[PDB]
From Swiss-Prot, chain C:
It comes from the Bacteria. Signal peptide: none annotated. This is Membrane-associated protein Vipp1. It is found in: Cell inner membrane. Belongs to the PspA/Vipp/IM30 family. The gene is vipp1. Transmembrane segments: none annotated. Required for thylakoid formation. Disruption phenotype: Essential, it cannot be completely disrupted. Cells with very low levels of protein have no ordered thylakoids, are barely green and are non-photosynthetic.
Length: 49, 55, 56, 55, 49
């Protein structure tokens, strides 16, 4: 049981580190900003109407 | 290294030789097909992680 | 649940650019047919001028 | 090309009308999405105008 | 009984997540708007009659 628990903790850390590191990088990080789509000017011009 | 420099030469010729086999008319629509089914695979994997947050 | 928000935004940003790509594909495939038709025409006019039957 | 131009001018109207419908329902995040679809259509229609006058 | 309950809860979550995620996407989301059909102008012109 104890020998099998360590195998589980090795898998969990391997997955989380690879996912965390891919969470860096400019595009993924900019994609989290709300106004990131870049039409806010024509959106504002439409809102003016 | 010298054999790095030779490698990068011979590797670049082969990559150019492929690049002029690409017909713009056929490959340009296949690229969109590939990019569409990539989204079908991705959506399945995402949903499978949502099921576990719920759980 | 902080990850699923990130993935759920990344999934929508992808389909937005598929839609753009698919609209451009149509316009490019049109231009490639026009350019190829004109290339065959300009090749025909050259060969005619090279025969120069009216000079003979 | 004169057929294609007449589609993309009337398809962009559909997405402009849908954006206004979204804002009257206050769904501003969905209005942005429709505006992104419109812009790509008005940019390609301008290419058909240039191509067609030259042809 | 307890072992079989967890199987049921796994099925329920798998179905709901796949259905929820397909509930996103522009067309399905616009289809929920009432005036989404796009004839309101000629409808209004008919109502004027």
């Amino acid at each position: 049981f104890e020998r099998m628990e360590n195998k589980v903790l090795d898998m969990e850390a391997t997955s989380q580190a690879a996912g965390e590191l891919a969470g860096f990088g400019i595009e993924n990080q900019f994609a989290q900003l709300e106004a990131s789509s870049g039409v806010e000017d024509e959106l504002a011009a439409l809102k003016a109407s | 290294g010298l054999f790095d420099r030779l490698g990068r030469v011979v590797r670049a010729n082969l990559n150019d030789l492929v690049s002029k086999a690409e017909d713009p008319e056929k490959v340009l629509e296949q690229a969109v097909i590939d990019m569409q089914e990539d989204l079908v695979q991705l959506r399945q994997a995402v949903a499978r992680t949502i099921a576990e947050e719920k759980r | 649940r902080t990850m699923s928000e990130n993935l759920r935004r990344n999934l929508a940003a992808l389909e937005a650019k598929i839609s753009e790509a698919k609209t451009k594909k149509n316009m490019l495939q049109a231009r490639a047919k026009a350019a190829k038709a004109n290339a065959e025409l300009q090749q025909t006019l050259a060969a005619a001028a090279a025969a120069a039957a009216a000079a003979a | 090309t004169e057929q294609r131009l007449n589609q993309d001018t009337q398809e962009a109207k559909k997405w402009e009308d849908r954006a206004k419908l979204a804002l009257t329902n206050g769904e501003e995040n969905l209005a942005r999405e429709a505006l992104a679809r419109k812009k790509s259509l008005t940019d390609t229609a301008a290419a058909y105008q240039t191509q067609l006058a030259q042809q």
